[PDB]
Specification:
part of a larger assembly; 3 chains; A alpha/beta (421); B mainly alpha (71); C alpha/beta (440); A: 421 residues; Rossmann fold; 60s Ribosomal Protein L30, Chain: A; Helix Hairpins; ten-stranded mixed sheet; two-stranded antiparallel sheet; 15 helices; B: 71 residues; mainly alpha; Methane Monooxygenase Hydroxylase, Chain G, domain 1; rod-shaped; binds guanosine-5'-triphosphate; binds Cyclostreptin; binds guanosine-5'-diphosphate; binds calcium ion; cytoskeleton (chain A); Tubulin beta-2B chain (chain A); methylation (chain A); acetylation (chain A); Beta_tubulin (chain A)
Chain lengths: 421, 71, 440
């Protein structure tokens, strides 16, 4: 079995992580007690990707729960699927990270990382053929952003030939008023550009706009936002969890999606928010993107599309051809056949049909330009820097982070402007 | 004619053996070059990661001085 | 004597192998347990079908085949499937981690860990042969194992078996069923690396087979199963001269003499007919003349290209079933008048004909109608170079930007291997131009 090891750090990481396990557990017929109660053998065909198989036919998520405060994990343990997680895979500190990337990455986080690695090592050592890791975390806080990126670097030292994949929640003033989020996000992106193979950009900005504008929720809650996140995470992992030909493991996905090592930040999307032509059109509409970027402001390097439910494969093939032909300007011509399509018979819960979209688009620069504008606005006046220098950090590290993220923007623009002739 | 017949067949033997020999050597040089290249890439990756850990030490050592030296 | 060893590499090679060996068993009357009631010599013999099947003392007829893949899940289906009793466990070789659509992992990182075991298993098949003739190697161009591991294996086979002949069935990629953006890279890398190690290669363009299934069999969205059953009929037509004998039978090596005028020009174009559904065949008996005419319809070619815009260097007709020379000669005469097959000026213009009287077979529950006679044309046409040109163009678009190249460099490869492979492809395309020009 090609096992994946799941890690979730911090409040957002554990919240998003718990919902993810709830959603896919339901999809695979696993109940909160770990026993299988499904109806189709397709549910168990690749169950070992995400679950360990214990005695008594118990399936235990191959998942590790990390945080520098106990609160969030306590409520996870008493959540819907709390009892399903392995008690020994809860690793929590007490001092907390105080929304401080330096505390998460250099001080408090550094005192706890060794304890987390011990658990990772035990999960990995009983793997038949470890694929790699997936991390859920936010970039705006302290534990998920600072200690999350520390864990990535330490894991990469011990598993340098494995795929590292993250679901990274980008901050937005529309959701959290914590002022130093642009600092924590820029410092985190500085690490993700170097040490992850693929990053799904889960943008609270887009999640809020979808809930408010599209779903018509005047006051969206974290539960509302996380409904979108869990449906998206289920969608983009479908090819990993069910039998299939396309992007069936983390490495083949990366080989298809990442033409240059640094440009590995994906714009995910979901439809619907119904006919096959309408489903595909929605899937490529900016309103359906989980990153606050308009694909028609850039060009696609690579795309993965996953259709779920019982539908005409001939029609999916025709509509995916039609969308590319009519939107040819927005796909780089020097990567032939850069849009891959997969179909899964099993729909997600509560839908007859769905489509999940993974785009590697140069329009993702809009996300980073937004973070960069907020970063520089605070850094130009050295606002709140003492929280970070007080942990030992030097302001040069802020300059280098800002510079590295600016280089990423320039890089996406270079390939947006590149031509075949 | 008999000596020419002998030279034809020994030429055929020599050519087949040189084809085998050349394929064997090229494959050894390719596999060793690839092995060295991949090892070097992994070494560069770990050296950068080790540089990060060194930098982490300097950070904590910087806080240590800030706290005890000032207080 | 004259044994042939088949090697099926990666998913495409393995699944096509499944289809071929099932079809061989039906053609020869071999049951899924390997028993063959018609074979009265137990534990051995020198019958035609013994070129492809060895025999055990218990009467089992065992394919002379190795299946190899760098992950287990495709070959696992063979281990538990209908024909599991056919193979000894040692003939089915699997690793745990595949090449991730990366030539470099198939040829180096992952492939090097299993190559010695594969060669050991092949040697055990060779040691049971009294007169091994050569190998038949089935693989995709596009997968990491089909590309990278096949080239590694072909290089090692040249070392261990000298100039013993090696033939390929190579699956050329099509966007309708391709699984990796980098398949043009893998295709050029493996074609360059295998070119001097292969005596003859039959390319199968997945898009050609896909179109044939859609257009001729009324299959809305062909699957690999649909594609592979058609591919196995073409493969069976080509190998039928090795597995059956008859007065008008012509050995594949005799066609090869005509098909390969220079060592590098070794890529025949296969065309097969008839491909028709049961519903259409019910009304119509398709004659020798009709299926021969179909051989010159580009829609029936296994590789998309236009031979009308190229020059022929050879034309071979492999008939099977209810076919007699008189009807073939008449059919060919008509085609010579109404079609203007243009040969290069340096080779004869005759068509080389073989006839196997054993009638064609179909697998139960398939889409192909059972017919009384079939034909596979093998031509050496300059037009096949069009397939290289389409691949080279896709290679060039990506490589100019070095897109995805870091995945290969990270596995130990160098940019010098890409340009060297592409230059070899440029010389091959030039070779095909040169042979088509008139003499002085
Ligand atoms: N005709 C046909 N083509 C296939 C089949 N399976 C895969 N392919 C084609 O082969 C190419 C992909 O290569 P695969 O054979 O699946 O890959 P592999 O050899 O197993 O290599 P890795 O999986 O990367 O280790 C694509 O062009 C597919 O369309 C098949 O059963 N029949
Ligand atoms: C989830 O998200 C929404 C956007 C639609 C797509 C998927 O299907 C759903 O069933 C579900 C919906 C949820 C709403 C329900 O329709 C209704 C009981 C109540 O308004 C639920 C609240 C939400 C925030 C979800 C909005 C729908 C799911 C991914
Ligand atoms: N979408 C979503 N975002 C969250 C959730 N919890 C926290 N966040 C975001 O995460 C950022 C704060 O990081 P947080 O996880 O709370 O800090 P940490 O616990 O130290 O890692 C803010 O931008 C929040 O908007 C959640 O459940 N869903
Ligand atoms: Ca016998
Ligand atoms: Mg918080
Ligand atoms: Mg494979």
């Amino acid at each position: 079995m090609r096992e994946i090891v799941h890690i979730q750090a911090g409040q957002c990481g554990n919240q998003i992580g718990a919902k993810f396990w709830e959603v896919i557990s339901d999809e695979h017929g696993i109940d909160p007690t770990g026993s299988y109660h499904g109806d189709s053998d397709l549910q168990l065909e690749r169950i070992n990707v995400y679950y360990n198989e214990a005695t008594g036919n118990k399936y235990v998520p191959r998942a590790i729960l990390v945080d520098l405060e106990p609160g969030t994990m306590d409520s996870v343990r008493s959540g819907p699927f709390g009892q399903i997680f392995r008690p020994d895979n809860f690793v929590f500190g007490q001092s907390g990270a105080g929304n401080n990337w330096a505390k998460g990455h250099y001080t408090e986080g550094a005192e706890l990382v060794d304890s987390v690695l011990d658990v990772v090592r035990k999960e990995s050592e009983s793997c038949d053929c470890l694929q790699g890791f997936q991390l859920t975390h936010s970039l705006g806080g302290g534990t998920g952003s600072g200690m999350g990126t520390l864990l990535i670097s330490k894991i990469r030292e011990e598993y340098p030939d494995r795929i590292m994949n993250t679901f990274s929640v980008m901050p937005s003033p529309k959701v959290s008023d914590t002022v130093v989020e642009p600092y924590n996000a820029t410092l985190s992106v500085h690490q993700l550009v170097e040490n992850t193979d693929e990053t799904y950009c889960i943008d609270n900005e887009a999640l809020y706009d979808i809930c408010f504008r599209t779903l018509k929720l005047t006051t969206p809650t974290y539960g509302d936002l996380n409904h979108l996140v869990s449906a998206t995470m289920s969608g983009v992992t479908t090819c990993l969890r069910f039998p299939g030909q396309l992007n069936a493991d983390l490495r083949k996905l990366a080989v298809n999606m990442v033409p240059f090592p640094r440009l590995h930040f994906f714009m995910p999307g979901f439809a619907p928010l119904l006919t096959v032509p309408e489903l595909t059109q929605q899937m490529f509409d900016s309103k359906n993107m989980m990153a606050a970027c308009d694909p028609r402001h850039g060009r696609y390097l690579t795309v993965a599309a996953i259709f779920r439910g019982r539908m005409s494969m001939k029609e999916v093939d025709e509509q995916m051809l039609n969308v590319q032909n009519k939107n040819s300007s927005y796909f780089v011509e020097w990567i032939p056949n850069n849009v891959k399509t997969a179909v899964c018979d099993i729909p997600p819960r509560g839908l007859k049909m769905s489509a999940t979209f993974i785009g590697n688009s140069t329009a993702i620069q809009e996300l980073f330009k937004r973070i960069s504008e907020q970063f520089t606005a605070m850094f130009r006046r050295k606002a709140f820097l003492h929280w970070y220098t007080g942990e030992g950090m030097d302001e040069m590290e802020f300059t280098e982070a800002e510079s590295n993220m600016n280089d990423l923007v320039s890089e996406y623009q270079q390939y947006q402007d590149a031509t075949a002739d | 004619k008999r000596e020419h017949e002998r030279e034809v067949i020994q030429k055929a033997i020599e050519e087949n053996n040189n084809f085998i020999k050349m394929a064997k050597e090229k494959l050894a040089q390719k596999m060793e070059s690839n092995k060295e290249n991949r090892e070097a890439h992994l070494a560069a990756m770990l050296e950068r990661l080790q540089e990060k850990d060194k930098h982490a030490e300097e950070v904590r050592k910087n806080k240590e001085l800030k706290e005890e030296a000032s207080r | 004597m004259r044994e042939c060893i088949s090697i099926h590499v990666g998913q495409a090679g393995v699944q096509i192998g499944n289809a071929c060996w099932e079809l061989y068993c039906l053609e020869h009357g071999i049951q899924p347990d390997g028993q063959m009631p018609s074979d009265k010599t137990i534990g051995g013999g020198d019958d035609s079908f013994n070129t492809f099947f060895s025999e055990t003392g218990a009467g089992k007829h065992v394919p002379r085949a190795v299946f190899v893949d760098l992950e287990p899940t495709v070959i696992d289906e063979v281990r538990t499937g209908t024909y599991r009793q056919l193979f000894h466990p040692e003939q089915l070789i699997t690793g745990k981690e595949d090449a991730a659509n990366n030539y470099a992992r198939g040829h180096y990182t992952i492939g090097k860990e299993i190559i010695d075991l594969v060669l050991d298993r092949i040697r055990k098949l060779a040691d049971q042969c009294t007169g091994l003739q050569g190998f038949l190697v089935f693989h995709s161009f596009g997968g990491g194992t089909g590309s990278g591991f096949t080239s590694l294996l072909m290089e090692r086979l040249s070392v261990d078996y000298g100039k013993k002949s090696k033939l390929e069935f190579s699956i050329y990629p099509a966007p309708q069923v391709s699984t990796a953006v980098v398949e043009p890279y893998n295709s050029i890398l493996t074609t360059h690396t295998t070119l001097e190690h292969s005596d003859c290669a039959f390319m199968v363009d997945n898009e050609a087979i896909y179109d044939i299934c859609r257009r001729n069999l009324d299959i809305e969205r062909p699957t690999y199963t649909n594609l592979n059953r058609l591919i196995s009929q073409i493969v069976s037509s080509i190998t039928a001269s090795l597995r059956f004998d008859g007065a008008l039978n012509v050995d594949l090596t005799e066609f090869q003499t005509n098909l390969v005028p220079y060592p590098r020009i070794h890529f025949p174009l296969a065309t097969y007919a008839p491909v028709i559904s049961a519903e259409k065949a019910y009304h119509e008996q398709l004659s020798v003349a009709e299926i021969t005419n179909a051989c010159f319809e580009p829609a029936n070619q296994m590789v998309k290209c236009d031979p009308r815009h190229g020059k022929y260097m050879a034309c071979c007709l492999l008939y099977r079933g209810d076919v007699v020379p008189k009807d073939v000669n008449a059919a060919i005469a008509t085609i010579k008048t109404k079609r203007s097959i243009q040969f290069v000026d340096w080779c004869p213009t005759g068509f080389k004909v073989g006839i196997n009287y054993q009638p064609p077979t179909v697998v139960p529950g398939g889409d192909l109608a059972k017919v009384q006679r079939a034909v596979c044309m093998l031509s050496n046409t300059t037009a096949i170079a069009e397939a290289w040109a389409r691949l080279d163009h896709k290679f060039d678009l990506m490589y100019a930007k070095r897109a995805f190249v870091h995945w290969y460099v990270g596995e130990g490869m160098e940019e010098g291997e890409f340009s060297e492979a592409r230059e070899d492809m440029a010389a091959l395309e030039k070779d095909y131009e040169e042979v088509g020009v008139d003499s002085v």
